[PDB]
Symmetry: C2
Subunit: 171 residues, 2 copies
């Protein structure tokens, strides 16, 4: 992957006005994130969860299902954020499986690149890797895979930087 | 129950600055809701789900658990909103169980009250009843019940009115 700064005028998840976007963001990220989305408030259906993850439980399936079946959403954005307390090198004992399992697996699978980086740059890399893995795994959900095969769904990854108030798309 | 307009300078979930509040809101409600919270952005841990519900699923349990065990939160707010598409009318087929079950149970349990109202007033009553039920059910959870009996947790209910740009506490 590479990071591409977004231009707010032409975001990949808004090539046409009027349609609703499922925005999947993190519980410890603020509203300030959506100011970098390129979407007006009335085009946003917002799921906000631990580490902007979708794990295969009833909440992920029901939210995906309602978004596709009732709102006929054609775009999903997974928005990670720099400074995230959940997608970081600090392993918090209060964080349950499978959220903790996803993060352990990322740390082991990407050990080579992560091992060469100090704390702040390591945590930024882990936010980005978490967004990529969430985008890849949501594409393999049964409901998303059938929509993608009809070219009736796109899933996008982005990272928001609180400090610069800018978003970066994962390409 | 009765509705009490909130004053932003004296919200029951912020009697002292610095501590984090778990804010449970709806996916089809906007950030505009949090402007009525009386909280600065860095005191908000936001869980945003179908119909501002907590059902007994891994996501609800893990988010509650991370909030209590890792963030040591002392206040939970369940925020419903007038004009909600999920807590409205009768059956949406796109809305899965147990979300659909909660709403059917509210429609049956409060049939007498709902029958006394027209459609728009019926929808508003269903938003308010949903918040009260979510607050009552969350209090009965094993983790919440132990914390409440130690006076180390409060759960609050509120409803946000987009038209008046005000929140109302459920007393
Ligand atoms: Zn986060
Ligand atoms: Zn927001
Ligand atoms: Zn709603």
């Amino acid at each position: 992957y590479q990071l591409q700064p977004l231009s707010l005028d032409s975001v990949p998840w808004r090539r046409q006005p009027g349609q609703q976007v499922l925005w999947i963001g993190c519980s410890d990220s603020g509203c300030d994130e959506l100011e970098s989305s390129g979407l007006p408030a009335d085009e946003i259906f917002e799921y906000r969860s631990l580490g902007n993850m979708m794990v295969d439980d009833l909440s992920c399936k029901a939210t995906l299902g309602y978004a596709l079946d009732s709102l006929k959403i054609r775009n999903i954005v997974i928005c990670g954020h720099y400074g995230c307390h959940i997608a970081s090198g600090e392993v918090n004992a209060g964080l349950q499986k499978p959220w903790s399992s996803v993060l352990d697996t990322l740390r082991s699978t990407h050990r080579r690149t992560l091992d060469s980086l100090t704390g702040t740059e390591r945590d930024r890399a882990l936010v980005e890797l978490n967004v990529l893995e969430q985008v890849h795994s949501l594409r393999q959900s049964a409901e998303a895979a059938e929509a993608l095969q009809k070219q009736q769904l796109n899933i996008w990854g982005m990272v928001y930087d609180k400090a610069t108030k800018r978003g970066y798309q994962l390409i």
